[PDB]
Design a protein around this ligand. Sequence first.
Ligand code: OGA
Ligand code: MG
Ligand code: NI
Ligand code: ZN
Length: 331
Amino acid sequence: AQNPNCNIMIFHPTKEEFNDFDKYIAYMESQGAHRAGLAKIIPPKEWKARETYDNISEILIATPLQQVASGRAGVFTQYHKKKKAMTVGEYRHLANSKKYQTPPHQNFEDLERKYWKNRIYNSPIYGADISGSLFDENTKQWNLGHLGTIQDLLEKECGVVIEGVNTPYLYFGMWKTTFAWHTEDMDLYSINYLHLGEPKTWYVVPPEHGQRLERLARELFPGSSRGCGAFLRHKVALISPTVLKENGIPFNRITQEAGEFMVTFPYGYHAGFNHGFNCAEAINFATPRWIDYGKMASQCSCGEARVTFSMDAFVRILQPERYDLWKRGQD
Ligand SMILES: O=C(O)CNC(=O)C(=O)O
Ligand SMILES: [Mg+2]
Ligand code: NI
Ligand SMILES: [Zn+2]
């Protein structure tokens, strides 16, 4: 078995190898990359996502989210308070203000220490989940707005035609902005490109050990666990690496820098934080290997998780027994 310790693997495709996206994902899996739950892909040196980022400031962040924490430094939840709209140029200025900017630090490890010590005492503002793309239309390789759609994959594998669309999302971050522990909708893959700015640190649990993380989360968030049998679908819970290590949960960590892709694999729990002002683009995708994970994915039916239009068909076809209850949660 390849990669039996479930380490995060880093790949350096050549420009020739960067042509066929599906083929390269299958290659990485042949080497055991999925066992970690997360992989880094450094694009060939010839490749670019677009010519410059000089003209992005007029993008609108319609609903910036202030991420307010509750709990203790290593075990907390966050809720999202909606803020008034602002442009990316306004948000960048905010991120660089004395109240919100990255503190002085020695290196990524020192910054990580400061994040876990101090996150809860601040409420950073995250320009998350913005439909759109920063890939130039002429970028033909690994253009996250030109991927094969999940609906087309389901149709190719299973023969059933379904409604729905699959488009990317932009994330504008600042120091301490945080993504809570989660897997993707329907335990899909994700791919994330860091277009510009400061780094993003990731934590990940191998898919084969995801239920260990879920059992710890039930213990640490006991009222949330009584409320919902899949409350990590709410995307609000944080658990630090120190707490994971104290409880024997297998995980790994890595820092993504501008110009790099990350892939999350089906049922790979992940969480993390931004180092400073940045912009990422991410989208879900599927492969034939996903189908079995989609059929087995947990679902929130308490009503809190509320997701896209396109998830309806995935539940209806892959999980017909669950469909009725899940849809009640959606409506
Ligand atoms: O970048 C973020 O805030 C969150 N991204 C992801 O969870 C992902 O790409 O799967
Ligand atoms: Mg603009
Ligand atoms: Ni994700
Ligand atoms: Zn729920």
